[PDB]
Amino acid sequence: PLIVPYNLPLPGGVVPRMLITILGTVKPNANRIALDFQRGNDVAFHFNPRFNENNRRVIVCNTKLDNNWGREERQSVFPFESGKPFKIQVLVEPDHFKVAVNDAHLLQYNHRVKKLNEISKLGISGDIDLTSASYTMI
Numbered sequence: 001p002l003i004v005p006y007n008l009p010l011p012g013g014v015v016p017r018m019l020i021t022i023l024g025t026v027k028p029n030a031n032r033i034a035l036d037f038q039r040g041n042d043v044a045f046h047f048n049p050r051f052n053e054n055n056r057r058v059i060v061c062n063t064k065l066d067n068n069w070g071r072e073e074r075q076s077v078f079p080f081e082s083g084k085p086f087k088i089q090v091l092v093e094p095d096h097f098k099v100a101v102n103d104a105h106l107l108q109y110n111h112r113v114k115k116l117n118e119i120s121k122l123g124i125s126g127d128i129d130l131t132s133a134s135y136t137m138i
């Protein structure tokens with residue numbers, strides 16, 4: 001296991017066709033999970049499952065620039081379940097990040113931060129047991 005929060009370096013940033021895989025288990029009474037693809041202090045891509053926002057489950061995505069959150073992108077399709085093993089795959093494409101959970105496509109997020117080769121860290125936080133975090137080129 002990996003301690004959470006966890007920082008995965010992404011040496012030399014990200015590039016199209018880079019696939020980042022996060023494996024773990026959702027805690028039984030989970031409230032929130034977050035992935036933060038960072039360019040220094042900026043968050044190029046924040047991926048944030050919320051298990052109980054107003055008695056809904058929702059996926060919130062956003063970007064943080066100079067410590068300011070931008071416009072949220074929200075999804076009600078919610079593939080996570082408390083207590084279960086999960087896989088999140090984030091595939092970097094030329095114009096977006098593409099996210100699949102448990103081998104099912106979830107969402108796309110267009111690039112707001114354009115210096116892909118400076119997005120050099122992935123933070124992983126929240127209500128998970130983290131098993132692995134890695135990357136490969138497809």
Ligand SMILES: CO[C@@H]1[C@@H](n2cc(-c3cc(F)c(F)c(F)c3)nn2)[C@@H](O)[C@@H](CO)O[C@@H]1Cc1cn(C(C)(C)C)nn1
Nearest residue numbers: 032033034046048060061062069070071072125126127
């Ligand atoms: C409440 O703060 C949220 C942000 N957040 C979550 C975590 C977080 C931290 C952990 F350690 C976790 F384990 C974990 F799962 C999530 N950190 N920051 C982030 O989600 C932001 C996305 O827009 O929305 C919130 C902040 C926000 C939003 N807005 C608008 C755009 C509506 C005006 N202004 N401020």
